[PDB]
Amino acid sequence: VFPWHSLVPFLAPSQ
Amino acid sequence: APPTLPPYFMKGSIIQLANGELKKVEDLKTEDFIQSAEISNDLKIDSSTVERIEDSHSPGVAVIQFAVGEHRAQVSVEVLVEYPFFVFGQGWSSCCPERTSQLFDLPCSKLSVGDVCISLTLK
């Protein structure tokens, strides 16, 4: 398997 | 050519959640990531409501303007449109489902203004 954080992006370092 | 496409996030990958679930990329619900992040303490979901979406002219670049939190702090971040954004209570989406499904074979819903995007922290 792959660690589920494989397709979840970040909207840049949020505040 | 490989047997199938790349195993990372490409269509058909068996993605394992923090709760131990083994689900196809294309079927992963936002609730799946929600739970996985919530069950974990080194991981967390965020609620950032895209209030605006602007093309940046640059190849496949669009800046999604997010209002982070209920205090709606706006962040203008230039992202490639092929980035599939998990949307908190809105679904499994991308800024360009066409391109994400085209290049990564991975189907996506349209990520548009109003969709509270999941920012997930991998500590």
mmCIF file with all atom_site columns, N, CA and C in Angstrom, chain A, chain B residues 8-9 15-16 18 28 33 43 66 73 75 84 92 119-120:
data_model
loop_
_atom_site.group_PDB
_atom_site.id
_atom_site.type_symbol
_atom_site.label_atom_id
_atom_site.label_alt_id
_atom_site.label_comp_id
_atom_site.label_asym_id
_atom_site.label_entity_id
_atom_site.label_seq_id
_atom_site.pdbx_PDB_ins_code
_atom_site.Cartn_x
_atom_site.Cartn_y
_atom_site.Cartn_z
_atom_site.occupancy
_atom_site.B_iso_or_equiv
_atom_site.pdbx_formal_charge
_atom_site.auth_seq_id
_atom_site.auth_comp_id
_atom_site.auth_asym_id
_atom_site.auth_atom_id
_atom_site.pdbx_PDB_model_num
ATOM 1  N N  . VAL A 1 1   ? 0.837   -1.224 0.000  1.00 0.00 ? 1   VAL A N  1
ATOM 2  C CA . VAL A 1 1   ? 0.000   0.000  0.000  1.00 0.00 ? 1   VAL A CA 1
ATOM 3  C C  . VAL A 1 1   ? 0.855   1.250  0.000  1.00 0.00 ? 1   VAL A C  1
ATOM 4  N N  . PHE A 1 2   ? 0.188   2.384  -0.110 1.00 0.00 ? 2   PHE A N  1
ATOM 5  C CA . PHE A 1 2   ? 0.834   3.673  0.018  1.00 0.00 ? 2   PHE A CA 1
ATOM 6  C C  . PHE A 1 2   ? 0.190   4.451  1.148  1.00 0.00 ? 2   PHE A C  1
ATOM 7  N N  . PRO A 1 3   ? 1.002   5.138  1.969  1.00 0.00 ? 3   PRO A N  1
ATOM 8  C CA . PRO A 1 3   ? 0.493   6.014  3.022  1.00 0.00 ? 3   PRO A CA 1
ATOM 9  C C  . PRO A 1 3   ? -0.510  6.998  2.442  1.00 0.00 ? 3   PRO A C  1
ATOM 10 N N  . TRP A 1 4   ? -1.701  7.047  3.036  1.00 0.00 ? 4   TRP A N  1
ATOM 11 C CA . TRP A 1 4   ? -2.840  7.743  2.450  1.00 0.00 ? 4   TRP A CA 1
ATOM 12 C C  . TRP A 1 4   ? -2.530  9.174  1.999  1.00 0.00 ? 4   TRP A C  1
ATOM 13 N N  . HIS A 1 5   ? -1.559  9.836  2.635  1.00 0.00 ? 5   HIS A N  1
ATOM 14 C CA . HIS A 1 5   ? -1.103  11.137 2.155  1.00 0.00 ? 5   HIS A CA 1
ATOM 15 C C  . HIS A 1 5   ? -0.320  10.987 0.840  1.00 0.00 ? 5   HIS A C  1
ATOM 16 N N  . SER A 1 6   ? -1.027  10.635 -0.218 1.00 0.00 ? 6   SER A N  1
ATOM 17 C CA . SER A 1 6   ? -0.408  10.408 -1.512 1.00 0.00 ? 6   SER A CA 1
ATOM 18 C C  . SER A 1 6   ? -1.052  11.295 -2.583 1.00 0.00 ? 6   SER A C  1
ATOM 19 N N  . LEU A 1 7   ? -2.226  11.824 -2.269 1.00 0.00 ? 7   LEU A N  1
ATOM 20 C CA . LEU A 1 7   ? -3.036  12.555 -3.243 1.00 0.00 ? 7   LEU A CA 1
ATOM 21 C C  . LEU A 1 7   ? -3.605  13.828 -2.629 1.00 0.00 ? 7   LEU A C  1
ATOM 22 N N  . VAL A 1 8   ? -3.317  14.057 -1.351 1.00 0.00 ? 8   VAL A N  1
ATOM 23 C CA . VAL A 1 8   ? -3.795  15.237 -0.668 1.00 0.00 ? 8   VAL A CA 1
ATOM 24 C C  . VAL A 1 8   ? -2.733  16.338 -0.712 1.00 0.00 ? 8   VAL A C  1
ATOM 25 N N  . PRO A 1 9   ? -3.001  17.412 -1.463 1.00 0.00 ? 9   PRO A N  1
ATOM 26 C CA . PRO A 1 9   ? -2.076  18.525 -1.596 1.00 0.00 ? 9   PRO A CA 1
ATOM 27 C C  . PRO A 1 9   ? -2.275  19.559 -0.499 1.00 0.00 ? 9   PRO A C  1
ATOM 28 N N  . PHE A 1 10  ? -1.353  20.495 -0.414 1.00 0.00 ? 10  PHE A N  1
ATOM 29 C CA . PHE A 1 10  ? -1.434  21.540 0.582  1.00 0.00 ? 10  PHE A CA 1
ATOM 30 C C  . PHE A 1 10  ? -1.598  22.874 -0.122 1.00 0.00 ? 10  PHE A C  1
ATOM 31 N N  . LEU A 1 11  ? -2.503  23.705 0.372  1.00 0.00 ? 11  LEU A N  1
ATOM 32 C CA . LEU A 1 11  ? -2.751  25.007 -0.238 1.00 0.00 ? 11  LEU A CA 1
ATOM 33 C C  . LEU A 1 11  ? -1.681  26.017 0.199  1.00 0.00 ? 11  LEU A C  1
ATOM 34 N N  . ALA A 1 12  ? -0.431  25.536 0.244  1.00 0.00 ? 12  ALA A N  1
ATOM 35 C CA . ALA A 1 12  ? 0.698   26.269 0.819  1.00 0.00 ? 12  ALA A CA 1
ATOM 36 C C  . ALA A 1 12  ? 0.564   26.313 2.339  1.00 0.00 ? 12  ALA A C  1
ATOM 37 N N  . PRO A 1 13  ? 1.675   26.549 3.063  1.00 0.00 ? 13  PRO A N  1
ATOM 38 C CA . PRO A 1 13  ? 1.652   26.686 4.521  1.00 0.00 ? 13  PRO A CA 1
ATOM 39 C C  . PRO A 1 13  ? 0.601   27.690 4.979  1.00 0.00 ? 13  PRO A C  1
ATOM 40 N N  . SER A 1 14  ? -0.512  27.170 5.469  1.00 0.00 ? 14  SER A N  1
ATOM 41 C CA . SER A 1 14  ? -1.616  27.992 5.918  1.00 0.00 ? 14  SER A CA 1
ATOM 42 C C  . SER A 1 14  ? -1.265  28.723 7.211  1.00 0.00 ? 14  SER A C  1
ATOM 43 N N  . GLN A 1 15  ? -2.023  29.761 7.513  1.00 0.00 ? 15  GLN A N  1
ATOM 44 C CA . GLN A 1 15  ? -1.788  30.557 8.696  1.00 0.00 ? 15  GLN A CA 1
ATOM 45 C C  . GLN A 1 15  ? -2.748  30.165 9.809  1.00 0.00 ? 15  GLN A C  1
ATOM 46 N N  . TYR B 2 8   ? 1.897   5.653  -6.963 1.00 0.00 ? 8   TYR B N  1
ATOM 47 C CA . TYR B 2 8   ? 1.627   6.822  -6.124 1.00 0.00 ? 8   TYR B CA 1
ATOM 48 C C  . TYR B 2 8   ? 0.497   7.665  -6.706 1.00 0.00 ? 8   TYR B C  1
ATOM 49 N N  . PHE B 2 9   ? -0.678  7.552  -6.087 1.00 0.00 ? 9   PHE B N  1
ATOM 50 C CA . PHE B 2 9   ? -1.853  8.405  -6.349 1.00 0.00 ? 9   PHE B CA 1
ATOM 51 C C  . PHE B 2 9   ? -2.473  8.217  -7.738 1.00 0.00 ? 9   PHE B C  1
ATOM 52 N N  . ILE B 2 15  ? -4.713  2.866  -1.688 1.00 0.00 ? 15  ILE B N  1
ATOM 53 C CA . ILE B 2 15  ? -4.317  3.843  -0.703 1.00 0.00 ? 15  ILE B CA 1
ATOM 54 C C  . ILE B 2 15  ? -4.762  3.386  0.683  1.00 0.00 ? 15  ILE B C  1
ATOM 55 N N  . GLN B 2 16  ? -3.825  3.343  1.620  1.00 0.00 ? 16  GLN B N  1
ATOM 56 C CA . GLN B 2 16  ? -4.127  2.884  2.966  1.00 0.00 ? 16  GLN B CA 1
ATOM 57 C C  . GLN B 2 16  ? -4.295  4.052  3.911  1.00 0.00 ? 16  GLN B C  1
ATOM 58 N N  . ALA B 2 18  ? -5.287  5.936  7.678  1.00 0.00 ? 18  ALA B N  1
ATOM 59 C CA . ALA B 2 18  ? -4.725  5.818  9.012  1.00 0.00 ? 18  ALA B CA 1
ATOM 60 C C  . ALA B 2 18  ? -5.509  4.811  9.842  1.00 0.00 ? 18  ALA B C  1
ATOM 61 N N  . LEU B 2 28  ? -11.624 7.059  -2.761 1.00 0.00 ? 28  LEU B N  1
ATOM 62 C CA . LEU B 2 28  ? -11.371 7.700  -1.487 1.00 0.00 ? 28  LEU B CA 1
ATOM 63 C C  . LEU B 2 28  ? -12.264 8.915  -1.315 1.00 0.00 ? 28  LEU B C  1
ATOM 64 N N  . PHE B 2 33  ? -10.142 10.663 4.401  1.00 0.00 ? 33  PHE B N  1
ATOM 65 C CA . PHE B 2 33  ? -8.963  11.399 4.836  1.00 0.00 ? 33  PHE B CA 1
ATOM 66 C C  . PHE B 2 33  ? -9.241  12.125 6.133  1.00 0.00 ? 33  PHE B C  1
ATOM 67 N N  . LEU B 2 43  ? -1.195  14.157 12.439 1.00 0.00 ? 43  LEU B N  1
ATOM 68 C CA . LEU B 2 43  ? -1.835  14.513 11.185 1.00 0.00 ? 43  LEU B CA 1
ATOM 69 C C  . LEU B 2 43  ? -3.105  15.299 11.479 1.00 0.00 ? 43  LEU B C  1
ATOM 70 N N  . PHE B 2 66  ? -7.664  31.105 -0.951 1.00 0.00 ? 66  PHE B N  1
ATOM 71 C CA . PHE B 2 66  ? -8.352  30.426 0.135  1.00 0.00 ? 66  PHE B CA 1
ATOM 72 C C  . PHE B 2 66  ? -8.579  31.342 1.319  1.00 0.00 ? 66  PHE B C  1
ATOM 73 N N  . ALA B 2 73  ? -8.915  34.013 6.726  1.00 0.00 ? 73  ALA B N  1
ATOM 74 C CA . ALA B 2 73  ? -7.669  34.648 6.354  1.00 0.00 ? 73  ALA B CA 1
ATOM 75 C C  . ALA B 2 73  ? -7.278  34.209 4.953  1.00 0.00 ? 73  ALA B C  1
ATOM 76 N N  . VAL B 2 75  ? -5.392  33.481 1.570  1.00 0.00 ? 75  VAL B N  1
ATOM 77 C CA . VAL B 2 75  ? -4.087  33.098 1.062  1.00 0.00 ? 75  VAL B CA 1
ATOM 78 C C  . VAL B 2 75  ? -4.166  32.886 -0.441 1.00 0.00 ? 75  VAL B C  1
ATOM 79 N N  . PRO B 2 84  ? -4.804  17.545 -7.556 1.00 0.00 ? 84  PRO B N  1
ATOM 80 C CA . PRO B 2 84  ? -6.114  17.125 -7.090 1.00 0.00 ? 84  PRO B CA 1
ATOM 81 C C  . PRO B 2 84  ? -6.328  17.477 -5.625 1.00 0.00 ? 84  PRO B C  1
ATOM 82 N N  . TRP B 2 92  ? -13.835 14.612 -3.671 1.00 0.00 ? 92  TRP B N  1
ATOM 83 C CA . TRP B 2 92  ? -12.510 14.323 -4.229 1.00 0.00 ? 92  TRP B CA 1
ATOM 84 C C  . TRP B 2 92  ? -12.359 15.085 -5.551 1.00 0.00 ? 92  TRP B C  1
ATOM 85 N N  . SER B 2 119 ? -6.416  21.050 3.839  1.00 0.00 ? 119 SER B N  1
ATOM 86 C CA . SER B 2 119 ? -4.985  21.127 4.056  1.00 0.00 ? 119 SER B CA 1
ATOM 87 C C  . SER B 2 119 ? -4.627  20.106 5.109  1.00 0.00 ? 119 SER B C  1
ATOM 88 N N  . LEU B 2 120 ? -3.804  19.152 4.752  1.00 0.00 ? 120 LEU B N  1
ATOM 89 C CA . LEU B 2 120 ? -3.472  18.105 5.671  1.00 0.00 ? 120 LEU B CA 1
ATOM 90 C C  . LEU B 2 120 ? -2.022  18.209 6.088  1.00 0.00 ? 120 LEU B C  1
#
